[PDB]
Amino acid sequence: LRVGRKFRIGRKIGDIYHGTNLISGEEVAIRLESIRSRHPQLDYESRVYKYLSGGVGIPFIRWFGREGEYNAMVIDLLGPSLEDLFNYCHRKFSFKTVIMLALQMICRVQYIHGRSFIHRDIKPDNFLMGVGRRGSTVHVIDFGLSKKYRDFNTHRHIPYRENKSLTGTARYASVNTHLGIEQSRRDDLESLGYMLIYFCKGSLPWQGLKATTKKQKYDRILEKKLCISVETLCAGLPLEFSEYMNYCRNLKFDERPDYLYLARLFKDLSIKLEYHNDHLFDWTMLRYTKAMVEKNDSFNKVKLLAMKKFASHFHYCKNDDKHYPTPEEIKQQTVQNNNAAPELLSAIDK
Numbered sequence: 001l002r003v004g005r006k007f008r009i010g011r012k013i014g015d016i017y018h019g020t021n022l023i024s025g026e027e028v029a030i031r032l033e034s035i036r037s038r039h040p041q042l043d044y045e046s047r048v049y050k051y052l053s054g055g056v057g058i059p060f061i062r063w064f065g066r067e068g069e070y071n072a073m074v075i076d077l078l079g080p081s082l083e084d085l086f087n088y089c090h091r092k093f094s095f096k097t098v099i100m101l102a103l104q105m106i107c108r109v110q111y112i113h114g115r116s117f118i119h120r121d122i123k124p125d126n127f128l129m130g131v132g133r134r135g136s137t138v139h140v141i142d143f144g145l146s147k148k149y150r151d152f153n154t155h156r157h158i159p160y161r162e163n164k165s166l167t168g169t170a171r172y173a174s175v176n177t178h179l180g181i182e183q184s185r186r187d188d189l190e191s192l193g194y195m196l197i198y199f200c201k202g203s204l205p206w207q208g209l210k211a212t213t214k215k216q217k218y219d220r221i222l223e224k225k226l227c228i229s230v231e232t233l234c235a236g237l238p239l240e241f242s243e244y245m246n247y248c249r250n251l252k253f254d255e256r257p258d259y260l261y262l263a264r265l266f267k268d269l270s271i272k273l274e275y276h277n278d279h280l281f282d283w284t285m286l287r288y289t290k291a292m293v294e295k296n297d298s299f300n301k302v303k304l305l306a307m308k309k310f311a312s313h314f315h316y317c318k319n320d321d322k323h324y325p326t327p328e329e330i331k332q333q334t335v336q337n338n339n340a341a342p343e344l345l346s347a348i349d350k
């Protein structure tokens with residue numbers, strides 16, 4: 001079970017495994033693919049990782065190639081995905097966490113696009129926090145569906161094309177992806193927009209649909225994405241979220257996104273909400289509070305204490321809201337958070 005010269009395959013995670021550099025003892029991750037795969041992808045994915053190497057929050061690939069009857073890829077060991085953490089937090093994130101996530105993910109996408117690639121599978125499962133002290137950094141994974149959208153030298157954009165079949169995940173797919181249009185930079189950013197809204201509101205209104213065929217499900221999703229107003233979609237969110245969505249839906253096919261303009265939506269908002277970009281995420285504070293306590297109902301209790309102790313960090317979308325709340329309206333929740341409630345309030349101060 002040796003890979004390259006110095007890496008040993010350990011337990012499954014997991015065709016991805018824990019691994020170990022035998023010289024240094026560093027824990028890594030190791031992805032295997034059979035050379036009898038009908039649809040090889042790992043060599044392509046390795047090569048994209050390698051071309052993207054050096055960008056912030058891009059997993060660093062340590063080794064890749066053929067080993068025995070496997071293609072193998074040795075890469076940084078990362079932590080939980082955003083979908084895992086979303087579940088850990090019972091499927092809603094605070095505005096602060098979504099903002100801090102948005103700021104990092106926009107930079108990740110900007111970096112990838114600046115290397116002439118589009119990801120094409122932007123979704124919560126494909127962003128992981130680092131392990132340990134790197135838990136503060138959002139990383140991007142799974143480049144198997146990525147694609148070069150312009151020439152490396154001339155920056156000549158790939159041609160406008162129609163009739164493409166949907167790839168990959170319908171829930172976060174852009175409207176133009178549903179319509180069969182060649183994906184480009186705008187579509188990565190639109191998907192990231194659906195994620196942000198999903199994180200804030202707890203769901204997207206086209207989840208849980210059923211149909212008689214694959215195509216019919218996709219089209220029922222498309223109709224909701226097309227026919228729902230941005231106001232309904234973004235109900236209860238500060239205006240920045242609908243402006244982000246409106247911006248992505250208006251980008252032309254070959255158009256260079258103004259990434260700084262989009263980052264400024266969230267950075268300017270963070271300042272108005274009095275959030276420091278301190279990488280203190282919802283899970284970080286929930287996990288910490290539970291640690292102190294232990295010295296679904298149980299979670300609700302931990303959460304109540306966390307939101308009391310960290311009253312100015314935990315502001316949530318109210319899904320009954322029909323309007324976009326102002327920052328002052330959102331910050332009223334700090335007062336409510338401190339107004340909640342003996343031996344437990346004592347332990348929390350401690």
Ligand SMILES: Nc1ncnc2c1ncn2[C@@H]1O[C@H](COP(=O)(O)OP(=O)(O)O)[C@@H](O)[C@H]1O
Pocket residue numbers: 013014015016029059075076077078079080081125128141
């Ligand atoms: N570099 C990495 N370090 C640690 N875990 C990873 C890494 N890359 C992917 N994972 C995790 O390994 C698990 C198995 O991944 P995989 O089965 O390929 O994803 P999926 O089940 O969505 O197809 C996932 O939970 C994913 O978050």
